Chain A
Amino acid sequence: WELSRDEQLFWERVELIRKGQVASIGSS
């Protein structure tokens, strides 16, 4: 139960610290 909580705490901090590359859109 601790391993499932701490893994979700891990990947929610990887999203906070280092953002990934943004996909493409079309500008108006």
Chain B
Amino acid sequence: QADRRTRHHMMVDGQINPREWFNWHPKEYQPWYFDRHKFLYEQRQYAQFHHLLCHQVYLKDMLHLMRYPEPYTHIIDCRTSTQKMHRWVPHSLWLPRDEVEYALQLSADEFLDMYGFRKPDKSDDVILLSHNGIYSEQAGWEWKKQFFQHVYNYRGGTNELFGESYSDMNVSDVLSPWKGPFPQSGVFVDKWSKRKVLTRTGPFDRQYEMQDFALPDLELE
């Protein structure tokens, strides 16, 4: 807390030296729409995985499968922390997220030995849950990595079913303000390009765009 100054060496250009060395150029980056309100994997940095997003099953589908279950629509819990689970979703099986990339590599007999329930067939419907729908989304990506044709995700599984207020506790790794990053300590590039990459135009909380080239606008004046 208390507004720690950060140990990065970014700086705005002064009022004395000319603007030079335009084979790198920082400018302010402003996109069209806000993405911070959206789901975490519906944001801007995950757009390329947009076709990898699992189809959504909703609350009413989950209540209908609670009341009237199907033999091959497998409800699977993807929550990892055993200290944060307090209730049982009906007709659910426990396959925690951090083991999924190993779990689908097993045979059916090894799946039965290492989890106590049968391995789902690749044509069976699989429905995944988590606290917010984040561990279930990564698990759905791991389930779609293998050739599983029908994989669905209930976004906000436990927190809407049981009414809890929990989270999957995703870190989203951001450097500590004592950790000095790469381009300050290094002779990987020449001194002009090193000074021109480390400069920015404005405060260092917003996003910027780095230009690899620039030509002078001779047609203005």
Contact = CB atoms under 8 A, between A and B. Distances in A.
Interface of A: 3, 6-7, 9-11, 13-14, 16-18, 20-21
Contacts, number: 25
A10 B96 CA distance: 13
Interface residues of B, number: 12
Contact of B115 (A3, A6, A17, A20): A17
25 contacts: A3-B90, A3-B91, A6-B91, A7-B88, A9-B116, A10-B88, A10-B92, A10-B93, A10-B94, A11-B88, A13-B94, A13-B115, A13-B116, A14-B82, A14-B85, A14-B94, A16-B116, A17-B94, A17-B96, A17-B115, A18-B82, A18-B96, A20-B82, A20-B83, A21-B83
Nearest to A3: B90
A16 B114 CA distance: 10
Contacts of B91: 3, 6
A18 to B, nearest CB: 5
A4 to B, nearest CB: 11
Counting chain A CB atoms within 10 Å of each CB, the highest count among B82, B93, B115 belongs to B82
A20 B93 CA distance: 19
Given A13-B116, A14-B82, 7 more contacts: A3-B91, A6-B91, A7-B88, A9-B116, A10-B94, A14-B94, A18-B96
